[PDB]
Point group: none
Chain length 144, copies 2
């Protein structure tokens, strides 16, 4: 029910125990999950897991009420050892966002730790269709 990660601070570099709670409440629905039924998504995910074992399949979509640029393609294969912060910056560059513009990631309504690898995120939060679902917004709470 509770998972923990460890992350050094950027200013005071001792390690935080970053607590994450499973099954958090949120309001977001994914248009990928509405345009494709479960079994179709699962077949696609299984085949892409067989083709690319070194990478995890991630769906990235804009959050409700978020005023921020659109993302052209929403399906990504990310190397397991790429950290969540690196993929964060990749998505920042793909949305063509100024360095001072805010971007927040949500995995089951929880901002993931920047220290973690995409492999860890996938292992801990991939759905039954073998996809990892990330939402993004410009504010810390979407749907507002």
């Amino acid at each position: 029910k509770i998972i923990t990660a460890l992350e050094k601070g950027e200013v005071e570099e001792s390690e935080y125990v970053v607590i994450t709670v499973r099954n958090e409440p949120g309001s977001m629905k994914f248009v990928y999950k509405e345009e494709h039924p479960f079994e179709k998504r699962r077949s696609e995910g299984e085949k892409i897991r067989k083709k690319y074992p070194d990478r995890v399949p991630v769906i990235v979509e804009k959050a409700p009420k978020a005023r921020i640029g659109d993302l052209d393609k929403k399906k990504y294969l990310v190397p397991s050892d790429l950290t969540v912060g690196q993929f964060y910056f990749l998505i920042r560059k793909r949305i063509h966002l100024r360095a001072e513009d805010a971007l927040f990631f949500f995995v089951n309504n929880v901002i993931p730790p920047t220290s973690a690898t995409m492999g860890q995120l996938y292992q801990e939060h991939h759905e039954e269709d073998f996809f990892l679902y990330i939402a993004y917004s410009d504010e810390s709470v979407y749907g507002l």
Copy 2:
């Protein structure tokens, strides 16, 4: 200690407050986290961690003086705002390896916080000037015994 009274006009409603201030009766709670790191470092780190993970609050947990209770391995936590104080109580209970009949008491400013509240509410109401929330824990109900 000392109990002082002053007078101060209000900002919006300009009648006068009788401002009571307590010089060490009770006194401030002391944390070794505040002793191993200077203020500017703690405050800048707290600002950065609130900007990085706004859905969580940064908490320092340390054992209280004279407390006869297990030690705590890690002392710096990032706690989801919507986690209730009792849930965090349970998390720390598990980290200390505590039996079902053993007491665990939290203290924020020498006061046992409300168990019903969320950690976000506690932080909003009691975070210090370094953007950290300081919780002490003990086996007795009064801080210092």
